[PDB]
Amino acid sequence: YGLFAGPCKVINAKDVDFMYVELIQRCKQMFLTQTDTGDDRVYQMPSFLQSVASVLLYLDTVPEVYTPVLEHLVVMQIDSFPQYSPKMQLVCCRAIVKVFLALAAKGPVLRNCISTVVHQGLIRICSKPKWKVPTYKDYVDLFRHLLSSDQMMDSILASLNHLLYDEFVKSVLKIVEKLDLTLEIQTMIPTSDPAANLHPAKPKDFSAFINLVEFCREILPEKQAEFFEPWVYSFSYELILQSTRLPLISGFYKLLSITVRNAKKIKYFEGKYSCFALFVKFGKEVAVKMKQYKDELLASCLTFLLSLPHNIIELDVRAYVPALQMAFKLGLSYTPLAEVGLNALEEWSIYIDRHVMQPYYKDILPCLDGYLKEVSALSRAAQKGFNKVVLKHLKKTKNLSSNEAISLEE
Amino acid sequence: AENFRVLVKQKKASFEEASNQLINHIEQFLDTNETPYFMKSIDCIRAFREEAIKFSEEQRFNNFLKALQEKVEIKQLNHFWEIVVQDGITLITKEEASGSSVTAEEAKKFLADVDDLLDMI
Amino acid sequence: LELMQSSVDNTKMVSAVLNGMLDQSFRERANQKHQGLKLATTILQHWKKCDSWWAKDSPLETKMAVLALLAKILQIDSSVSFNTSHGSFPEVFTTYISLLADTKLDLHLKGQAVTLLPFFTSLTGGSLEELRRVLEQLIVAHFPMQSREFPPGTPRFNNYVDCMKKFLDALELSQSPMLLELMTEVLCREQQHVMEELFQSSFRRIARRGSCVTQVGLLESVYEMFRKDDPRLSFTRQSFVDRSLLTLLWHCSLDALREFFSTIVVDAIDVLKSRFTKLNESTFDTQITKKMGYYKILDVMYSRLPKDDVHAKESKINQVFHGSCITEGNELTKTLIKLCYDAFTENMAGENQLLERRRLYHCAAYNCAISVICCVFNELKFYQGFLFSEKPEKNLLIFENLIDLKRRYNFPVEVSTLSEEMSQFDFSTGELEMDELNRHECMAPLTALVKHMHRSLRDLPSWMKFLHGKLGNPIVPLNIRLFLAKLVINTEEVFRPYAKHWLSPLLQLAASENNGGEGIHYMV
């Protein structure tokens, strides 16, 4: 139907307007109106969206009454990604990429809606916690197909990565503006800042936030050749203006460490001058304020501080070695900050010119001496030789090999 | 009624396989005796009366008139009585013959201890 | 004003500007709920300037934009566009009528029209007669002729469920006595429309609303549409009291309901005290079904009521005899128990005209009997007197009439803030298992009765030894002999201490080759 809607343009020039109405009327009353919960008519939604995109390519003069059905369908298909099988979780990606290719090549009075479909999809996946519910750990595959390895996904369909990148950044900043992340007193006289005053008054927003930060972390390591270049001043200024009056909420330092790692991956630091003074004026404040914290907040603060560029922020090198002799003693029982301690001590001493450095070695190195001091289906398959079922439990039990939990011997 | 002339007008199987279901489709309008229901069936009986002389349905002709005479002579149903005796679509009108041109005079001729324990409590 | 002076030249842009102003006046309604109603007031006082929208010959998109515009306008404000001739109620109600009136759209293009009935089913019957008239015109012109007859998978029944679900949500949120009096009429036309479960749950949601002076109105409406002499068939007459008012009665009527119990009894105790003019079956079976409905209503009303206001001297028994005088207390139970014991005892040796519905009438009298014996003084041998203790010399057959004794039983072998920013995208867009014998419409009150006999106070005469006498003979009909064992099966906790006498007839049922087929397996 959706394929032959193409060549029927040159035969009637009204049936192309008859389809996309009959098609949307079939598409509505199957999984929006009735039997949205109990139905099995889910395994053809990729064919549905592929058909609607292939007719929307040829359809000019949009009705502008069914676009709140199109963009109430495509967020349903983005929502219904992990109730699937492999080698169809890629067909769903091809469908969504095809639709987003379709409604962006006709007019800029239309394509504002491409900025609210992804905003609604982010508010969809950033609130989920017999059955099982997938939390955020498998939408990351779709959101990396949609941006990073996309040139083998828009090849077979007739840039878009730039547009979807900018829409993702606008959505991830527009969520964090209205969240009400302030926290109230819960039921002696304490001293520390995390206390019985660790209770956010909007507890569903907090879960949205702690699902948002790890999602942004796993979505933006790379593909930042210039796609994160013009954003760093606005994004950094927003995060500083937030977290200066939001002290004891972790994750803000996590997003800051993400953008400052990208600001070191791109060059951006050969002094643009407006952020060079914000970082210098904030680094002193966290370096003096991080004494009276505790564990899972200290980890984020230290991973922020020991990733500042510091081949450029060389001035007052004594302002951070109490946060480098802390990154090693707080190692040895939680590894990936004992990794960033060595990864910062290797970055400093090869780049900082070796005369401000050399007095500061008897207070870095003497804390570096805690380091120099059955039956499954695989087994039952391997016990009866090798006949193709060890291939089954070698291929189907594969591809989850990305957790780089760094052990202690390396 | 008009949306069901698609079989006896293009092509079909053996003829009058629509007449046996037509009485089924027009009988069910008088289960509930509401006011607008009586006027939907008079359009059907004023819609096959013109096809009985056209589609060569003499065997339907003298058949579909006792169909609405028995249904008005079973019960009272006077609201459906007045609309079929004030206008009149009833028993065979012209001659019981397909070749004629005479009027409907025959229609106007046809239409004018088990008690001890009870009181103890 | 300046924006609606230009209402004909550029309709699309003024519609879009009005929508963008409307939802933005809806968004910050938490701090500025003064302008969000004043804007809707000011646009409703200017409906004269737009008439090329909701007229004929316009293509069918501006009309849907008018529907969505009016839907936003009336979903934002208060219920103020109806009352005391406030504003342009003629020229908004003419729009609301004429949009769904003419056969100009399709059926799923009036679905957006049938959404806003809760704001506009709270009028007086002057124009509301016209409202019911055009609703019934839609019913007789758009619904299927006889029954469903279209599976989900044709382009008519998918539409039909798409329309009826919106109807059911309208009836769910609007407690309106007219829409129920249409939905009950469209339901009871066959044996079962296959969407019964959402129907029953929706009726349950109607039953619990509060403001308890309106549930009497709902039950009064369905009672009056059941009671009158609109000459319907037997099935449609029975199905009302079967499955559209008993759902409301059983779920949640009222915790202190004496109104619908008081104002009904001298309307149907007379037709229970009536005769049978056995000359023609049309007046026969209708009177049987009316007696059956009165039986079931009195059954439920005796069941889910306390005993003090029905048995003691109160303001509920001074109804049947001589007004509000002190007669003797609890007389209604006496004049009911006499005629119900008179029922289910009529021998029908020559009576062979309509006997299955009379069997249903007998079983309904039985259920009413157990429900009133639930409310009797329930100590001495009333249990031995009533529901048992016949005298078969004068042809008193309790079980051999209500048990069918003609059907060959089958018996098979064995087998927060983001909810708000997510709703802003939704504002501006849009026991046992019953095989063959466990549903015999007598078993559950009998089992509850035997259980109540246990946890209320040799053989036990009228309910164990009497069944022992009526099971030990292999000369009794078969179906009663099978029916009586699925009481000691389901309630063996009473028969376990007296299982020393229940030792032979179960094995006589199992061993003798008179069970059915190759022997009725799973029973064995």
Contacts of C347 (CB under 8 A, 6+ apart): C395, C396, C397, C401
The answer to whether the Cβ–Cβ distance between B118 and C389 falls below 8 Å is no
Q: Torsion angle of alpha carbons C464, C467, C472, C478, nearest 10°?
A: -150
Residue C80: strand, helix, or coil: coil
User: What's the CA angle centered on A299, arms A295 and A302, to 5 degrees?
Assistant: 130
Please name the member of C61, C64, C417 whose beta carbon is closest to the beta carbon of A205. C417
Chains A and C touch (3+ CB pairs under 8 A): yes
The answer to whether the Cβ–Cβ distance between B36 and C334 falls below 8 Å is no
HSE of C168, CA atoms in CB hemisphere, 13 A = 20
The pair of three-digit structure tokens given for residue C81, joined into one six-digit string: 């566009």
Name chain C contacts of A125, Cβ cutoff 8 Å. none
Contacts of C402 (CB under 8 A, 6+ apart): C344, C359, C362, C363, C366, C442
CA nearest to C505, candidates C477, C479, C484: C484
Q: How far apart are CA C281 and CA B74, in angstroms?
A: 12
Determine phi and psi for C500, rounding to 5 degrees: -70, -25
- The nearest CA of chain A is from the CA of C163 a distance in Å of 10
Chains that touch A (3 or more CB pairs under 8 A): C
3-state helix, strand, coil in chain C (%, to 5): 55, 0, 45
Q: How far apart are CA B94 and CA B112, in angstroms?
A: 18
Residue of C nearest to B28 (CA): C146
Q: Torsion angle of alpha carbons C219, C222, C228, C233, nearest 10°?
A: -140
The pair of three-digit structure tokens given for residue C431, joined into one six-digit string: 């026991």
- The nearest CA of chain C is from the CA of B18 a distance in Å of 17
The answer to whether the Cβ–Cβ distance between A208 and C418 falls below 8 Å is yes
- The nearest CA of chain C is from the CA of B101 a distance in Å of 36
Determine phi and psi for C247, rounding to 5 degrees: -65, -40
- The nearest CA of chain C is from the CA of B70 a distance in Å of 16
Q: Beta-carbon neighbour count of residue C158 at 10 Å? A: 21
Name chain C contacts of B117, Cβ cutoff 8 Å. 381-382, 385
The answer to whether the Cβ–Cβ distance between C231 and B75 falls below 8 Å is yes
CA nearest to C383, candidates C450, C441, C444, C447: C450
Contacts of A78 (CB under 8 A, 6+ apart): A96, A117, A121, A124, A125, A142
Resolution of the experimental model, in Å, one decimal:
3.9
Per DSSP, A83 falls in state S
Please name the member of B36, B75, B118 whose beta carbon is closest to the beta carbon of C334. B118
* C152 strand-pairing partners: C154
Residue A183: strand, helix, or coil: strand
Q: How far apart are CA A92 and CA C511, in angstroms?
A: 64
Residue of C nearest to A32 (CA): C162
The answer to whether the Cβ–Cβ distance between C231 and B77 falls below 8 Å is yes
Please name the member of C137, C145, C382 whose beta carbon is closest to the beta carbon of B28. C145
* C154 strand-pairing partners: C152
**HEC secondary structure over C447-507:** HHHHHHHHCCCCCCHHHHHHHHHHHHCCCCCHHHHHHCHHHHCCCHHHHCCCCCCCCCHHH
CA nearest to C74, candidates C95, C100, C51: C95
* C519 strand-pairing partners: C517
Q: Do residues A319 and A287 lie in contact, with contact meaning Cβ atoms separated by under 8 Å?
A: yes
Q: How far apart are CA C95 and CA C120, in angstroms?
A: 13
- The nearest CA of chain A is from the CA of C189 a distance in Å of 24
Contacts of A407 (CB under 8 A, 6+ apart): A335
Q: A384 exposed, middle or buried (CB, 10 Å; 0-12, 13-18, 19+)?
A: exposed
Q: How far apart are CA A169 and CA A220, in angstroms?
A: 10
Q: Do residues A107 and C406 lie in contact, with contact meaning Cβ atoms separated by under 8 Å?
A: no
Q: Beta-carbon neighbour count of residue A69 at 10 Å? A: 17
Q: Is C381 on the interface with B (CB under 8 A)?
A: yes
Contacts of A261 (CB under 8 A, 6+ apart): A307
CA nearest to C122, candidates C93, C70, C83, C85: C83
- The nearest CA of chain C is from the CA of B109 a distance in Å of 30
Residues making up chain B, counted from first to last: 121
The pair of three-digit structure tokens given for residue C122, joined into one six-digit string: 């709270």
The pair of three-digit structure tokens given for residue B28, joined into one six-digit string: 């069910």
The answer to whether the Cβ–Cβ distance between C417 and A180 falls below 8 Å is yes
Name chain C contacts of B31, Cβ cutoff 8 Å. 189, 232-233, 236
The pair of three-digit structure tokens given for residue A56, joined into one six-digit string: 């929307």
CA nearest to C167, candidates C226, C94, C116, C219: C116
List the determination method: cryo-EM
The answer to whether the Cβ–Cβ distance between A29 and C416 falls below 8 Å is no
CA nearest to B102, candidates B93, B90, B112: B93
Q: Beta-carbon neighbour count of residue C411 at 10 Å? A: 19
Chain A interface test: which of C107, C158, C418, C428 (most A C-beta within 10 Å): C418
Q: Beta-carbon neighbour count of residue A55 at 10 Å? A: 24
The pair of three-digit structure tokens given for residue A13, joined into one six-digit string: 């020039």
Per DSSP, C279 falls in state T
Per DSSP, C413 falls in state S
Distance, CA of C139 to chain centre: 20
Q: Do residues C188 and C239 lie in contact, with contact meaning Cβ atoms separated by under 8 Å?
A: yes
Distance, CA of C302 to chain centre: 18
Chains that touch C (3 or more CB pairs under 8 A): A, B
Helices marked H in A266-399: 273-289, 295-305, 325-329, 335-351, 377-383, 389-395
The answer to whether the Cβ–Cβ distance between B36 and C230 falls below 8 Å is no
Q: C244 exposed, middle or buried (CB, 10 Å; 0-12, 13-18, 19+)?
A: buried
Q: Do residues A361 and A318 lie in contact, with contact meaning Cβ atoms separated by under 8 Å?
A: no
Residue for token pair 């339901």:
C187
